[PDB]
């Protein structure tokens, strides 16, 4: 170990896993699982090289890139670039690491990885960014492949990055094919693409629904609270109207838009504040119509969680901890039954621990049932494997088609959850098996046995 | 010729397909495809290599692998593994040059192929069988890939095997593709895969009482004496009492099971079957309870076709030469009108001929038809390809999605039996075309003409 | 051990070499080498595969191509190709497991192989012979390359068919490297090419010579006996004559030429005799001038040896089992002491063992010595290596040059020959060691200790 | 500059390169030549991989594998692989990145790598080191070749290791070529090898014994001073013998051997202490004989220097910091001139600077003058490319060819040193120059040029 560099991120990943593992009945019934815990916890594969590349001045500069390649027992190395100036190993391991096991959740066929460079995309010119992308990718594509590695976007990568990074790989590979996702419309992208974690997230809660009350109860009727104004929380908000129930909450970086009384949202106000963020502008400046008005209240500096009222389902997709404990227990007070994570670990522990807690405390659809973002978010990474699957027959399907099969790969992480909780987490008689749990075991479990029909330990 | 070495397994194929041929009008129709028989029959590659392991004493050990490629002209090679101490180049050749036309009957795009080794699987550990795999694949990956050769299971080759040849693969090609087939639900395998071979034979019954009825019939409200008890004849058995029918009969190694009067099977009974099996307990041991009892007759020592009474279908799906021509007899006694072979080989020679006689003797549906093996089988080869299809897209059907391409599969083989019979062994007025003799020249006739289309001969 | 197919020809040099084994005290000081002896027997890589072409009738026609990859611990796989009737597996297995040991003692770095095809060049035009040859290249340079496998010559294959071979490697690989042995001077072949194998035999027994007979009983005044008058024999007699020795005998298949007291034949009247055989002619010319009428006694049909008279080293380099037992026996009465084949398996076992009888009788240098053309033919396999050398360096060598290192090449079998069994043989009582068994297992043990440093066993 | 983690060795080796350079006149002649030390310390690619293997208990074992292929601006990558269990990337970026610019020195066409693994070959079996090379290797080929990175020998890869390395990537490419080095003479190892550094520091020294005291002060008639008893050691006595010196003290690991008066160690008694040290035996071998008890006295435990008495020539050749200061300065007492490293880094700073200031201040001849190893020990890092060129050759070169070219590439070292420095140094009044600093600044030049003509940087 003495050899052993220090890899803080990495390293508390680790932790974490090994703590959750450890606080289950799995190295119970598996005790040689350990072994696989050991083995999974070194990637196969990690690539660092020079990235040089020339600035607007003409003047030459030196930066580093990496792709970690952690696993691919379950299919294709499949993760995000990310170009930040901190990039270093020891974060991409952590990001690698995590990738892993919140792709195999999704049950499609995605390995694990992560791969990225130090340069600093701030104060950048569109040019300065193509020069880069073209030095980066002319030693990645040695790395990567349809079938072998497929990366995609992540900070610092958009839309405007991955076009570079296609284009350097074709003229090097001679090659077209799903080797990124997240592409142009033209050029081998894929349709849903924009809806895709807000649709999934209300699918995931709707099979947690389903289940918690044996089919009786949907969205149908049900009054909905969200928050956050971007992608996620639009095209949850259509989806969960389309489903015949109330979006009763929107909320931005300054505040939150509540329905007064009983009423929802319409699509035609959803698009009214799409926008209004892609303007950046305040969702302030629409009660500021005459529209909305009484319709309307906006709270600024607040979330939405108190103000509500009653509520059935809540979604927080809008950024990191925005959820506390005691907004937790004012969602559980207003007789909310489903808490599913649109963004990433929107809920603090605070919040877990007392959804957690009341879930043991009442039976059945009496409870509070909590849904990490790894399994809710997973909208986005499954439509790249939509995209990565669109590449492979050079067709594109409809909207209608590559909804369907998110619906379906959500349905396979609700599943994933439930039953891995039902077996390593198994909960007391009737209450609801733990989804958080259930979805922190259940990608290692998949990736680890799978390891071993493959041979990767013994 | 005083070169050519003696493979009698393979000569033996040889000699009875150029009977099969020989006794039609194709070469009369078509007499410059001697020339296809003549190229055909040698194989485009074959492969043998070293290969050395560690037994758990740690010794060195040698054995001899084989990859016979055989005919690509219809899609890439396509063929099993048998790991066995009888395995050598004469065994591999006849099964390989078989694969190339039961393949082809699929309609779907496969070559022909068979591969394995002299490996001796008795008496070793799952260690040694892990450093075997691994010693195998490092050679066999230089000429196998997933558009080139799909290797699949065979004797001595199960689902452990292909997971540790695949995850050889994986490490020394650094890719994940469609290599192999069989392989694990979390890595690539593909549903309906159990139900695949019992499907089938029910669905090639189904086109077959279709023609030969005008539509008029099906398996609703008939009688089917299945014999077997291991996975074909538990899936054809549900598929039977699916539309409609009545499973008279089952039967294992040691005696048969037969319904009392009007009845059949029922699912709840075939899966307390199954959990018999799988136990290794003996079909007798279920009569044993007062379940069943008065509703069941247990035939110890004895097959199930005399005893049945009356039928209409059934299926052999037990061993090899499980129909003799008395019992043959005794099936057109009851009115048996449909025959088809779940297990490879069923019916003897003197059992074919019993049904080839009254199929020309009797017109339309007084016949009793008789389906042979290599196109009633074909639902594992079938699913095999699905499993392909599948890993192409990176994509899992639903089981239903692989149930419907099963089906029509199944259509297609029906079809490329029935059509070559109405061409190159054209019945008399009235007559029901010969499904075994058209089974016999289809696949042939299909694989010469797309060689010469390539060029393949002239 | 009954699965292995029937090797006639491979299980005679096993069974041969594997008796001159354990013969020795080699498995006493190693027993752990019969461990070598069972690995290095089965080959690394066998490919066998259709080779189609259009014969000038239009009409397809089909053979079968192989390339036997017996070892490379030492060096890439090299050994030849032979066009004929007659070929199968067990024949070039044989020829390639012969050709790892006869590599080795050339202390070059070349391992074993053989291939070629049971076409028969006999009766083909040549533009029949360029096709098939095309056709066998296509599949065949997928397995081969100048860093991997360099073929060569044998019976089938002259220079003609090296050319045709070489083009469609280019036009395949778009390469051009020493892929081929053989080849025109214009296009990567070596100088020496064509008397290699001749200046090979009597550069051996000039080491021979050396080592009976210490104080330089050299060449120099010997009548040395030849047989064979093709190009093996003609550089033969060419070198001792430089030599300062006595060329005495030349002989035809039909045919033998003596001359008749003391004298020699002079490098003019060989070039008398090439030019017969670029005629296809006869000996037959003491005709042309009483002078030749003198110096030389000719006798048809029939063969040299006895009619010598008195003396002292013999050349046979017409084909295999020159006839034997009586001659040899004859060839001690002349005071021949020194006996090396230059065409491959020339003396028949009752010449061999004869003239090792009078080795274990006659201390040194009163014996009859006796070289296996395992070193004594070895010249030729050393300039291929050497024609690799020089395609290396990207330059064409002097003669000088090539025949230098040729020389030394030469003296390494020789050491290679003589230091084994002066080890494993141990002649005692002052006996000239065996170097038939000498240089038998002397390439066995140089191949298998490198088999060892690397993994292939332990 | 946050991002990048803690490197401590490898930091070490830039600042103290960096504070070499700019202590120089080459920034202000090349200033733009700073652009260049900032590309050429990024390596240009970094592969890490997992290692799984199985020990003799059956145990499946996880170590790390690594290839730091630093730059091939003049030629491919080239450096050693190192098994030990404190291996991590920062000591082989150290070590890599210092064998950029030790391989420029050669004046070959060598680029700078290194990699190794943590794994630790104390207490593994043989079969366990075999496991572990195959593993390693499986990887390792992907990445390496003979034209592209060729490995060779470090502390834990011994030619055993070497052994088992190349024969798994000749069964993964299926190739045979210069991939690695330092290999058996059998499979294309090279004359000269063992020998190599031994004779290369004598060769360096004799030239910085030319330059200072033109008129030949030679090793002819000097007492020179070594140290260590290893093969290093052994050759390096062994060459000044030859030369006419007189070698007076040898050193054991625990142990120290001297001349007692005038006279030397004799090539018989180098060859009794060899033979001592396959026995793993201490030197105590002039209790041999009272001959041998006297010439010789003999200091257990302790060093040699300071009692050796009055000479010209040391030779540290044993380990690191051989331990120093006040020998150093006893060295000047004796007429120790010249002072080169066998052994890496074999004198500690104190020396090292003690020696350079004794240069400063004595004007040229009157000097000690210390060369650093890197050059000194290129000896081996020489018949390395020379190993490589032979395979490139398919030849085995005389050891007087090797020794010969050997010879040459020394003096290429003293001459990149000696010219460069009395460049970018400038000794001044008549000084010897600097070689210590002109070896170190040489070899970055010679990089970053050729790195300027290529694209590297601008």
């Not at 930066?63 to 930040?84: C, E, I, M, T």
């Not at 792709?103 to 694990?112: D, F, I, K, V, Y």
């Not at 992308?133 to 497929?150: K, N, Q, S, Y």
């Amino acid at each position: 170990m003495s050899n052993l560099p220090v890899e803080p991120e990495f390293e508390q990943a680790y932790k974490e896993l090994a703590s959750t593992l450890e606080n289950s009945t799995l190295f119970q019934k598996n005790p040689e699982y350990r072994k696989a815990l050991a083995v999974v916890s070194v990637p196969e594969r990690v690539i660092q090289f020079r990235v040089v590349w020339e600035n607007d001045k003409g003047e030459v500069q030196v930066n580093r890139g990496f792709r970690v390649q952690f696993n691919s027992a379950l299919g294709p190395y499949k993760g995000g670039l990310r170009f930040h100036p901190s990039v270093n190993l020891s974060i991409l391991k952590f990001l690698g690491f995590e990738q892993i096991f919140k792709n195999a959740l999704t049950g499609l066929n995605m390995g694990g990885g992560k791969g990225g460079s130090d340069f600093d995309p701030k104060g950048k010119s569109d040019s300065e960014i193509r020069r880069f992308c073209v030095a980066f990718m002319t030693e990645l594509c040695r790395h990567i492949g349809a079938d072998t590695d497929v990366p995609a976007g992540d900070i610092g990568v958009t839309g405007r990055e991955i076009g570079y990074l296609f284009g350097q790989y074709r003229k090097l590979r001679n090659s077209w094919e799903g080797v990124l996702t997240g592409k142009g419309g033209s050029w081998g992208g894929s349709l849903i693409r924009p809806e895709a974690t807000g649709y999934g997230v209300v699918y995931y809660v709707e099979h947690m629904i389903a289940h918690a009350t044996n089919g009786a109860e949907s969205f149908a009727g049900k009054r909905v609270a969200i928050s956050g104004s971007g992608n996620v929380a639009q095209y949850a908000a259509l989806k969960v109207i389309e489903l015949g129930g109330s979006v009763v909450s929107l909320s931005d970086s300054q505040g939150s838009l509540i329905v007064n009384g009983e009423g929802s949202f319409t699509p035609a106000e959803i698009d009214a504040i799409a926008a209004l963020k892609v303007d950046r502008k305040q969702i302030a400046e629409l009660v500021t119509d005459a529209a909305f008005a009484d319709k309307f209240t906006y709270l600024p500096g607040q979330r939405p969680w108190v103000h509500v009222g009653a509520v059935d389902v809540a979604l927080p997709s809008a950024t990191q901890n925005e959820v506390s404990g005691e907004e937790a227990q004012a969602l559980i007070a207003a007789g909310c039954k489903f808490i599913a994570e649109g963004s990433n670990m929107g809920c603090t522990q605070a919040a877990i621990d007392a959804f957690e807690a009341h879930r043991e405390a009442n039976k059945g659809a009496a409870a509070i049932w909590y849904a990490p973002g790894k399994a809710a978010n997973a909208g986005g990474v499954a439509v790249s494997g939509l995209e990565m699957a669109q590449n492979s027959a050079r067709l594109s399907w409809t909207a209608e088609e590559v909804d369907a099969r998110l619906k379906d790969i959500m349905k396979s992480c609700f599943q994933n959850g439930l039953d891995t909780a039902k077996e390593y987490a198994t909960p007391a008689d009737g209450i609801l098996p733990s989804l958080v749990t259930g979805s922190n075991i259940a990608g290692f479990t998949k990736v680890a046995a799978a390891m071993k029909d493959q041979g990767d330990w013994w």
